[PDB]
Amino acid sequence: ELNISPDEIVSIREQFNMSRGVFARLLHTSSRTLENWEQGRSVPNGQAVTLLKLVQRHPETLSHIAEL
Amino acid sequence: ELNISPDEIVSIREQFNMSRGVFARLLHTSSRTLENWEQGRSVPNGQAVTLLKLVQRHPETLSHIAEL
DNA sequence: GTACGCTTGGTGCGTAC
DNA sequence: GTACGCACCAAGCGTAC
């Protein structure tokens, strides 16, 4: 039952010192959609929650995504 | 933009020799939603596509999801 | 398995500030 | 960055087979 708050989403990419645009691009995610999540206008879908928590635990995941 | 065909999704799972229910569980995904993807009813969302492709390239990603 | 109908709300903008 | 409106359709069923 994974979930993630708007503040947690922001704190992930601020740990990496990445802007919203940089982080969204490296996550193969629309920056406007990421804006929705960080502002709290909608709940991210289940796989987006999994992906965010994966990247947080294993930041090299961003490199694996770039290798797809 | 990453794409994945319904047959591609099934073969990822059949690599692990897992039923639709088992694979959806380890991927923190509704088994009925996965049914939509494998039948071609719907296009998986962008983060779902990324997750599936990570798993296809790195099977250990499945175990990493369980650590979450 | 397969397939189709349904409600809900996320997606991904456009726009203004 | 903030916040709101909008169309489109994915999500996650319930059901029939």
B66–chain A Cβ distance below 8 A for any pair:
no
- Residue A57 to residue B67: CA distance in whole angstroms: 9
DSSP state of B16: T
Resolution reading in Å? 2.3
A:B CB pairs within 8 Å? 64
Q: How many domains does chain B have?
A: 1
Give dist(CA A43, CA A48) in Å, integer: 10
C-beta atoms surrounding B28 within 10 Å = 17
Q: For residue A53, list chain B residues with Cβ-Cβ distance below 8 A.
A: 68
Amino acid of residue B17: N
Alpha-carbon distance B8 to A59, whole Å? 26
Provide the residue range defining the domain that includes B45: 1-68
Contacts of B16 (CB under 8 A, 6+ apart): B23, B59, B62
Contact indicator for A67, B57 with CB cutoff of 8 Å: yes
Report whether A61 contacts A27 (CB < 8 A). Answer: no
Please give, rounded to a whole number of angstroms, the shortest distance from the CA of A58 to a CA of chain B.
9
Q: Are the CB atoms for B39 and B6 separated by under 8 Å?
A: yes
For this PDB entry, the determination method is X-ray
Interface test mutation site (partner B, options A47, A51, A60, A62, max chain B beta carbons within 10 A) = A47
Alpha helices in chain B (DSSP H): 6-15, 20-26, 31-39, 46-57, 61-66
| Three-state DSSP class for residue A36 | helix
Residues with Cβ within 8 Å of A56's Cβ and at least 6 positions away in sequence, in order, are: A12, A15
Judge whether A59 is closer than 8 Å to chain B, CB to CB: no
